[PDB]
């Protein structure tokens, strides 16, 4: 056996997969192994989320995360995201499962059964992870991959059925976008946009022209920058800036990963377009508006003025003022008054939520989206007890957001750990201490004393 | 001395480890404790 | 549900998505046969 | 059901390994 | 080092097995059939789900006298028929 | 040299008293800023309206606190998670009413204290060291980003974020307690076995290495100088303390290997500390303890209390009384 | 069919746990690998047919 | 508080571009080993 | 060499688990108390004392399962099996909660044997004897909150329930009556063990990267031997890189371990003074010129006067029936509530 012990490694079991650094062969059965666990998974949960659902229950109340990603992409669905057929969800679980037969046995393959290098039998898969240029080739060829992927979704959005749209006029259905925002203005501006509370960066994109356009703008650009990574080397500046090792540029994609893992856990948090509340449940803002909703209807009903009605603290008991003056629901919920939900905005007007549309135009469909969605909060324990801590059993409910964000905060934690330690370590094992101290030539031993 | 690798050993009361602790996970979603 | 001809597979769909788990498990019975060397 | 499905998956693992041993296989 | 047998070397053995493959199944079985045959509710005390309360006692039977605890409990028990 | 070059040398000299570095720079101005207005808002601030209901809590000692009581206090309900420096105020007796120290305290001191995990790597690549001692601070770095950032932002403000002061970090436990039954998740106690166990084993390998010195003393001296500054010799003997340590519990249970020893000594307070980070950070979202509210039934269905039941009556007792003005509907979602 | 669905899934079903436990020992095994190679080559090309034959008389069963 | 902000906004500059710019001074070769 | 040192001589043998003289004490009180708190969060209820569902057999899990304290009535009766309560009754005695002082103590009783093991060990293999005396925290620890503070208090009901949720309830009931987190000794108990926490993290993480490179691997526990006179780590570069990043760093070793000893022992040391005087209800409950204040200013709000409204409501929520021998009925309007909840 080549590198499969300590002694010729140099790294034990536990660290055993850093054998595979320079062994090109197996490290790509490695990952394409790797990669069919990941589509294996894909399939079968989608499988067994489609064996367990019940189609008149909510998808939120069944614990299922994968078929709302489907649904949001415009199958299976009709009018207020109701599912009008589960054979696109069949089909997505089923062609996934088998793909991974497809990527395990080429896994399987490659580390196992075939060269263990690639570099003798072939110069284009063959590879160094100091040859700087072969390194932009790779990821020129993935950057092309990656945005024809994302103009995948733009062609499901566009000319092959639509997605699900929240704010489609009339309720939510599934629309298909016919112009998407091409504006720059727009699509970068939302990069621009402070990540605090009313701005909310990227996660506040609200409407799926603006998520149709970045992804033509994001195809287009990873299409520019993998031709552009195929033809050319490294920049001076950049040469000098970055370790140039395969553990250094694992880290580089450790840290990316670690950002985009923190990002998604705010985006199905709080944005409820591309994580529409039909299929992922209400948000934590919807849910606090939406009891503050429930009440002052309610109360509204028994004849209450709920424009004049004074809280205890003298704040409004169901309105009072944003500190820029813009009408929103008092209680505690004064803090989620930038939430926007389609069920919400048509009370709103210029200066906020409009007493004579409150007082007139609240339909019963509004009025039963905010109790089921007061009831339906993203709160609940860890053995999936709805509700507060103090709830007693019997509703089994946690919210398909909280598991969403809850395991992409722990995995982007971990990510960035890893981050850490694989770039401290890239750095040491490049500048050639990363095993310890020199004792011959120890650096602080020729180092003047600070006192 | 040595007739059964260890690594058979380990693997089998590791496997009867995760049955008897799963049963466990089990019982507390049926019978006593379950809430139901 | 699944479409009901494949509702025989169903004790087998509910198994499934765990598989993965057992890969992990299964690189420690494998460096268990070679002794973790 | 579940059960002997499971104990099917969860034996071809080790069985794989097993398998590999006696064989004098590339472990 | 002790002078004692490696465990790496017993639970490896055929011999160890062929007495520990009949012990380890029937020390489970008489755990099993302690409980299954109910004698550790008598050994212990410890209330079946259905001798927690009288059938209209809503009250805990709560010990209140130390050195007429054994009685109260008995009482409590013989409140349950 | 041009004076670019001439201060990079400087930034990275490994002769300061004080390593500045890349980091460093970030570091410095940061936590000087956030340092200056803590020490000013403990001392003097006003009182700020935290839960947004024009109820002002006092945190500082010239109005009336102590050291105990005082606290920066959280900023206010009505500001939720938006960003508010300064310059968003009309006037600096706003800022201070609405609780914008606290913003200012705690952004500052959250980017100055992830520089200080930078500069940790950059100082052990500067001295030739390896570079995990960073890893090893991201633990409390973690827990401090889950307390003062990660948890206003899964609640929606910035008002439930941890108080800057002693008093109110125990408000800020009992409230989450009520709120997730942090005791019954176990993150938290994974995290309490790290931090008991990393007590634990800091007593156990002080107590081990304490107890194998090796005599180069009198009795009228300090055993401390039987140890120089320097010198090549390990100061206690590895193998008497393994041979104790073997025999108190036995012998494969006791490291006779340093460096693993010393690797588990990091090891299981950092992974037990990450955990309890990710416990609040979880909670942040809601994930909460495990509920067994009502779990064990007779066979007629009367709820027999464990526990867990009792537990549940102390946290309705911290949530009922809680944010006691605060709540104007039956449940509180945020 | 209706009968030839759930005996070419069964069929698939067993034939993939064949795969599963018989291609790694087949690949890690460089004994016996020649007449390994057809019996991999032969099951592979009997699981795309079959995958093929099951999903196309999925739409005469439903 | 615009002069404020205007002054924050260019101290805050001013500070990143000292952290930028000097990690990209070549900083790899700022060890007491490989300084290539 | 008579039968006195013939004895001697086999409780010392090397073996794989030593005996010793404080074998006799500490191996059949250990495996009772652990065998106690096994037995009976299987087995045993606390329906008669507590009015709780305690043990698997009942439905509880691990986290919910406790051995629980005897009923108040008890009083601090040692509630011996052969004692005139149970009368040699076990399975009365089960229902009296006499596991509970048979676990405690029997488990004091393994502690004692516990540290004149770790003084016998040292004794025999010539090295100080700082193991036993770093343990006195921890029986410092089970001493005051085990055996002083429900001996202070009205019966064994009030001490710790052995059970992880029990251990729960424990913290929150000395939150809601004792104000325990405003008590100096408590928080010089939390500073000894963060700060030990902290100094074993530390410690750990910089030895192992100030590590000699003595081997070619990039796995480097190998390149310790147990048998070198050498250093492993380099101290001096330990000592300079924290002196740059933090100011202040060690230059002696020994100093070093004994501060490591010295943190979270002292720290629990203290905890135990602070509920030896919970045992009394000596609390550092109040602030008496905060009181004097908030009672006279009705706007005067700290973080102190929101805990102790905390505090109240934790009493007259869990006490019906945590305190289930009071006989408690609370009215639900005298209870203390928020608005709205
Ligand atoms: C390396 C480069 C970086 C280093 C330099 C540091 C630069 C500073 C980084 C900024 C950190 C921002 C903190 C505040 C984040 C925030 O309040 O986050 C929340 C925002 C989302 O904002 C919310 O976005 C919402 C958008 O929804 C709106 O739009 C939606 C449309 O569907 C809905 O309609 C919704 O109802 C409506 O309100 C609203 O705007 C809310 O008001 C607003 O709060 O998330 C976001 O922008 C997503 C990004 C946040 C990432 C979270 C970072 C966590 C990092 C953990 C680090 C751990 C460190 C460990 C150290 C060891
Ligand atoms: C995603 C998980 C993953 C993957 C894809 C790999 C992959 C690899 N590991 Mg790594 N490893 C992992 C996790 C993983 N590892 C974990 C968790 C540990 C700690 C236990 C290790 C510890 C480790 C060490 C110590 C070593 C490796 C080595 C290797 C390489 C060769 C393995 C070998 O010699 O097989 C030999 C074993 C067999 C042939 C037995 C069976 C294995 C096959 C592949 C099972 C396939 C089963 C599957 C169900 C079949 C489906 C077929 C179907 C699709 C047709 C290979 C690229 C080795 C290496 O680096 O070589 C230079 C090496 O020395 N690994
Ligand atoms: C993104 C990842 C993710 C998310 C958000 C979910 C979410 C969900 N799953 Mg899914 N699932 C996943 C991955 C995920 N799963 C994986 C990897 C598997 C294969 C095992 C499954 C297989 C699966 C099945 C079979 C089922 C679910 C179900 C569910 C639902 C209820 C979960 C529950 O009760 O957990 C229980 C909670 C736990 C088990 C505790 C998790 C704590 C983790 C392990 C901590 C990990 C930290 C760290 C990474 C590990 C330490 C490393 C560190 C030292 C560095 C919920 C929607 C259920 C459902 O409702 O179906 C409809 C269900 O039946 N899942
Ligand atoms: C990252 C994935 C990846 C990469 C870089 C390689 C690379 C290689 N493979 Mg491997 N392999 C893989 C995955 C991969 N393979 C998979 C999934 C399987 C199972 C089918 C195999 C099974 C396999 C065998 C049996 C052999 C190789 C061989 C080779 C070598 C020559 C192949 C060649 O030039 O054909 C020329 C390429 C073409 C004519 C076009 C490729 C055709 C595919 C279908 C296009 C797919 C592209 C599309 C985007 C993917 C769809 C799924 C996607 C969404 C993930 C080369 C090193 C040979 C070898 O080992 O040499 C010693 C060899 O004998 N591969
Ligand atoms: C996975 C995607 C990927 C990866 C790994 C790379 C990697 C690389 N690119 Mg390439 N690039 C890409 C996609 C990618 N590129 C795409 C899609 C395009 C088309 C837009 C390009 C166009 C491009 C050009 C024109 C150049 C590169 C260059 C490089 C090399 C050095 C870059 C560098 O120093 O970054 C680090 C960035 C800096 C040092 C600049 C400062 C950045 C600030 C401080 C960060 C601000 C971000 C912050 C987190 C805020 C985010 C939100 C914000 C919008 C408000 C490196 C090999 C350079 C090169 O070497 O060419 C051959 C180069 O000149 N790329
Ligand atoms: C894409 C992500 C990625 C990749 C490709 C790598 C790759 C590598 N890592 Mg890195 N690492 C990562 C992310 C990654 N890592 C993250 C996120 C962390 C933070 C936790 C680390 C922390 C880390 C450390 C501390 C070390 C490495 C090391 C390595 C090298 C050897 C790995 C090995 O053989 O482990 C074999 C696998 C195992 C021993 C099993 C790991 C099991 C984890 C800890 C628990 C998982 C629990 C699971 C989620 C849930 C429970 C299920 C269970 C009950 C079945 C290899 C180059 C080693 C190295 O530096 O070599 C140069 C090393 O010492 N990594
Ligand atoms: C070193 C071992 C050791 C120690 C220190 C203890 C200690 C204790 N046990 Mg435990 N116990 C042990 C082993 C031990 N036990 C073993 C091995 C078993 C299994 C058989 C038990 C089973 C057990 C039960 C069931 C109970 C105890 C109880 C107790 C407590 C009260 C005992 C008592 O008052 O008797 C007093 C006896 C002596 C002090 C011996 C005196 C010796 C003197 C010096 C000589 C004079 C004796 C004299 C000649 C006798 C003549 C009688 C004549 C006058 C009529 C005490 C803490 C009780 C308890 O836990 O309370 C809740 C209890 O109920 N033990
Ligand atoms: C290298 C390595 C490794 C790894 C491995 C891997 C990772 C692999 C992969 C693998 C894979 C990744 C595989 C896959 C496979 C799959 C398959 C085999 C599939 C099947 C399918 C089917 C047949 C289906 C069926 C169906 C239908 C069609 C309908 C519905 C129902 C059902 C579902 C039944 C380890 C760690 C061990 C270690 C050593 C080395
Ligand atoms: C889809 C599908 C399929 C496939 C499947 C597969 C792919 C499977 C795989 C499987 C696997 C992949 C398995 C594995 C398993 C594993 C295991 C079962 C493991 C265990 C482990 C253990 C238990 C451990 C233990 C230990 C050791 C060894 C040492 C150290 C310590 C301890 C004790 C921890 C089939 C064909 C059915 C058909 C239908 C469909
Ligand atoms: C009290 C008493 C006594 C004693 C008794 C005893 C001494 C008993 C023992 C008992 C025992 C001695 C028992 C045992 C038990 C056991 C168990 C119950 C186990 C369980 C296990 C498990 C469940 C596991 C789990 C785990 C862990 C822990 C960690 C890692 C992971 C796992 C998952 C594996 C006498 C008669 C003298 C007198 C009267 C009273
Ligand atoms: C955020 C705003 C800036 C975005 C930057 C994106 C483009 C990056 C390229 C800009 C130039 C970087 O180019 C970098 O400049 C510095 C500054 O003198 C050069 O010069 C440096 O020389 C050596 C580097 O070994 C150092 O010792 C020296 O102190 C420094 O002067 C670096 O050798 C060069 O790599
Ligand atoms: O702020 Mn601070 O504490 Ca978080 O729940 Mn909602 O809000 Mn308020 O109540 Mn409970
Ligand atoms: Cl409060
Ligand atoms: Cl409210
Ligand atoms: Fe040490
Ligand atoms: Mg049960």
Redesign the pocket.
Do not use: A, K, R, Y
């Given at each position: 056996a080549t590198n499969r012990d300590q002694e010729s490694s140099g790294f034990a079991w536990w660290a055993g997969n850093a054998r595979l650094i320079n062994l090109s062969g197996k490290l790509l059965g490695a990952h394409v192994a790797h990669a069919g666990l990941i589509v294996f998974?894909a399939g079968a949960?989608t499988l067994?989320?489609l064996a367990?659902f019940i189609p008149e229950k909510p998808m939120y109340e069944?614990?299922?995360?994968l078929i709302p990603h489907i649904a949001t992409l415009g199958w299976g669905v009709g009018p207020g995201g109701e599912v009008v057929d589960t054979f696109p969800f069949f089909v997505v679980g089923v062609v996934h499962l088998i793909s991974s037969a497809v990527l395990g046995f080429g896994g399987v393959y490659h580390a196992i059964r075939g060269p263990e290098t690639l570099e003798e039998y072939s110069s284009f898969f063959g590879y160094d992870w100091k040859d700087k240029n072969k390194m932009t080739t790779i990821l020129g060829f993935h950057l092309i991959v990656l945005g024809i992927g994302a103009l995948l979704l733009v062609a499901k959005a566009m000319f092959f059925g639509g997605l699900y749209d929240t704010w489609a006029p009339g309720g939510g259905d599934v629309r298909v976008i016919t112009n998407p925002t091409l504006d720059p203005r727009v699509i970068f501006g939302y990069l621009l946009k402070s990540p605090f509370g009313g701005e909310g960066w990227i996660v506040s994109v609200n409407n799926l022209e603006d998520v149709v356009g970045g992804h033509i703008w994001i195809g287009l650009i990873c299409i520019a920058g993998g031709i552009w990574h195929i033809l050319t080397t490294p920049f001076g500046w950049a040469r000098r800036a970055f370790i140039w090792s395969g553990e250094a540029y694992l880290s580089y994609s450790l840290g990316a990963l670690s950002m985009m893992g923190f990002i998604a856990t705010c985006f199905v948090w709080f944005n409820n377009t591309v994580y529409p509340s039909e299929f992922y449940g209400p948000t934590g803002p919807e849910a606090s508006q939406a009891q503050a909703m429930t009440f002052l209807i309610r109360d509204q009903k028994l004849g209450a003025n709920v424009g004049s009605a004074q809280g205890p603290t003298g704040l409004g008991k169901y309105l009072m003022r944003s500190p820029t003056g813009e009408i929103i629901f008092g209680g505690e919920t004064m803090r989620f008054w930038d939430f926007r939900g389609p069920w919400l905005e048509p009370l709103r007007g210029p200066n906020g939520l409009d007493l004579n549309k409150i007082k007139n135009d609240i339909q019963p469909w509004q009025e039963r989206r905010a109790a089921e969605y007061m009831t339906h909060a993203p709160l609940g324990s860890?053995?999936?007890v709805g509700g507060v801590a103090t709830e007693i059993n019997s509703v089994n409910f946690?919210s398909?957001r909280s598991?969403?964000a809850?395991?992409?905060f722990?995995?982007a934690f971990?990510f960035l750990?890893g981050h850490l330690w694989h770039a401290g370590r890239a750095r040491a094992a490049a500048a050639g201490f990363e095993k310890g101290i020199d004792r011959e030539s120890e650096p602080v031993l020729s180092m003047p004393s600070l006192d | 001395g040595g007739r059964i690798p260890l690594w058979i050993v380990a693997t089998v009361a590791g496997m009867g480890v995760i049955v008897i602790v799963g049963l466990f996970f089990y019982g507390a979603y049926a019978g006593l404790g379950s809430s139901l | 549900k699944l479409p009901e001809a494949y509702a025989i597979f169903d004790p087998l769909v509910?198994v499934l998505?765990?598989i993965?788990?057992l890969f992990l498990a299964l690189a420690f019975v494998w460096q268990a046969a070679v002794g973790f060397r | 059901a579940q059960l002997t499905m499971i104990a099917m998956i969860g034996i071809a693992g080790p069985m794989i390994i097993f398998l590999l041993a006696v064989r004098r296989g590339n472990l | 080092t002790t002078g004692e047998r490696p465990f790496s070397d017993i639970i490896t053995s055929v011999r160890y097995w062929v007495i520990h493959s009949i012990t380890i199944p029937a020390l489970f079985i008489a755990g099993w059939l302690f409980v299954s045959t109910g004698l550790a509710y008598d050994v212990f005390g410890t209330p079946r789900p259905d001798s927690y309360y009288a059938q209209e006692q809503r009250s805990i039977p709560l010990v209140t006298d130390r050195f007429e605890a054994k009685q109260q409990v008995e009482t409590f028990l013989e409140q349950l028929k | 040299a041009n004076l670019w070059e001439r201060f990079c040398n400087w930034v990275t000299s490994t002769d300061n008293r004080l390593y500045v570095g890349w980091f460093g720079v970030i570091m410095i101005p940061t936590l000087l800023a956030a340092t200056i207005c803590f020490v000013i808002a403990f001392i003097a601030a006003p009182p700020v309206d935290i839960d947004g209901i024009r109820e002002p809590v006092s945190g500082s000692l010239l109005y009336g606190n102590n050291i105990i009581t005082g606290a920066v206090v959280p900023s206010s309900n009505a500001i939720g998670l938006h960003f508010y420096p300064i310059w968003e105020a009309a006037s600096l007796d706003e800022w201070l009413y609405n609780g914008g120290p606290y913003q200012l305290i705690i952004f500052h001191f959250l980017l100055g204290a992830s520089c200080y995990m930078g500069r940790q790597w950059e100082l052990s690549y500067r001295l030739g060291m390896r570079p995990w001692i960073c890893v090893a601070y991201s633990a409390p770095l973690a827990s401090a980003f889950a307390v003062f950032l990660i948890y206003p932002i899964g609640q929606g403000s910035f008002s439930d974020g941890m108080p800057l002061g002693i008093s109110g970090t125990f408000n800020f436990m009992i409230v989450f307690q009520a709120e997730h039954n942090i005791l019954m998740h176990p993150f938290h106690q994974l995290g309490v076995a790290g931090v008991f166990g990393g007590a634990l084993f800091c007593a156990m390998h002080g107590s081990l290495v304490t107890s194998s010195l090796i005599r180069e003393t009198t009795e009228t001296e300090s055993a401390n100088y039987g140890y120089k500054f320097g010198q090549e010799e390990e100061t206690y003997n590895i193998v008497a303390a393994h041979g104790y340590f073997g025999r108190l519990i036995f012998q494969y249970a006791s490291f006779n290997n340093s460096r693993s020893l010393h690797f588990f000594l990091a090891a299981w307070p950092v992974?037990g500390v990450?955990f309890a980070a990710?416990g609040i950070s979880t909670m942040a979202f809601n994930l909460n303890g495990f509920n067994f509210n009502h779990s064990v039934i007779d066979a007629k269905g009367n709820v027999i209390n464990t526990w867990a039941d009792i537990i549940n009556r102390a946290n309705l007792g911290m949530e009922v009384m809680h944010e006691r003005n605060a709540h104007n509907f039956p449940l509180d979602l945020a | 069919m209706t009968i030839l669905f759930q005996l070419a899934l069964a069929a698939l079903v067993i034939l993939s746990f064949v795969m599963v436990i018989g291609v790694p020992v087949a690949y890690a095994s460089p004994q016996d690998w020649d007449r390994s190679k057809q019996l991999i080559f032969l099951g592979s090309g009997l699981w795309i047919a079959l995958v093929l034959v099951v999903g196309v008389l999925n739409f005469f069963v439903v | 508080m615009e002069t404020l902000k205007i002054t924050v906004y260019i101290v805050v500059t001013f500070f990143v571009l000292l952290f930028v710019f000097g990690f990209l001074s070549g900083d790899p070769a700022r060890n007491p080993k490989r300084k290539d | 060499r008579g039968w006195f040192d013939i004895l001697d001589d086999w409780l010392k043998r090397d073996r794989f688990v030593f005996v010793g003289w404080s074998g006799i004490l500490l191996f059949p009180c250990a495996y009772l108390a652990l065998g106690g708190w096994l037995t009976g969060t299987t087995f045993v209820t606390s329906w008669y004392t507590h009015g709780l569902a305690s043990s698997y057999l009942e439905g509880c899990n691990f986290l919910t399962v406790a051995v629980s304290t005897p009923a108040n009535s008890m009083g601090h009766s040692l509630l011996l099996l052969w004692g005139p309560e149970a009368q040699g009754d076990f399975t009365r005695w089960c229902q009296l909660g006499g596991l509970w002082t048979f676990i405690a103590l029997h488990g004091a009783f393994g502690l004692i044997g516990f540290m004149l093991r770790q003084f016998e060990i040292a004794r025999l293999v010539g090295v100080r004897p700082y193991n036993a005396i770093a343990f006195s925290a921890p029986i410092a620890v089970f001493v005051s909150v085990f055996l002083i503070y429900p001996l202070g208090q009205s019966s064994w009901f009030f001490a710790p329930s052995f059970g992880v949720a029990a251990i729960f309830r424990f913290l929150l009931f000395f939150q809601g009556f004792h104000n325990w987190t405003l008590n100096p000794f408590h928080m010089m108990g939390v500073a000894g063990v963060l700060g030990g926490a902290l100094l074993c993290a530390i410690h750990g993480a910089t030895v192992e990267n100030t590590l000699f490179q003595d081997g070619e691997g990039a796995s480097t526990f190998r390149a310790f031997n147990p048998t070198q006179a050498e250093e492993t780590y380099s101290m001096v570069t330990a000592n300079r890189f924290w002196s740059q990043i933090f100011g202040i760093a060690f230059s002696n070793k020994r100093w070093l371990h004994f501060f490591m000893l010295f943190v979270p022992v002292t720290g629990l040391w203290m905890s135990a003074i602070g509920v030896v005087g919970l045992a009394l209800n000596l609390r550092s409950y109040d602030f008496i010129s905060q009181e004097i204040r908030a009672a006279e200013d009705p706007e005067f709000e700290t973080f102190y006067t929101k805990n102790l409204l905390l505090n109240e409501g934790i009493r007259a929520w869990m006490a019906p029936q945590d305190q289930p021998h009071e006989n408690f009925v609370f009215p639900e309007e005298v209870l203390p509530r928020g608005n709205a909840l």
């Open positions: 998974w949960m067994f989320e367990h069944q614990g299922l995360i860890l053995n999936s946690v398909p598991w969403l809850t395991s992409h722990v995995l971990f750990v | - | 509910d998505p765990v993965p788990v | - | - | 992974v990450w990710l | - | - | -």
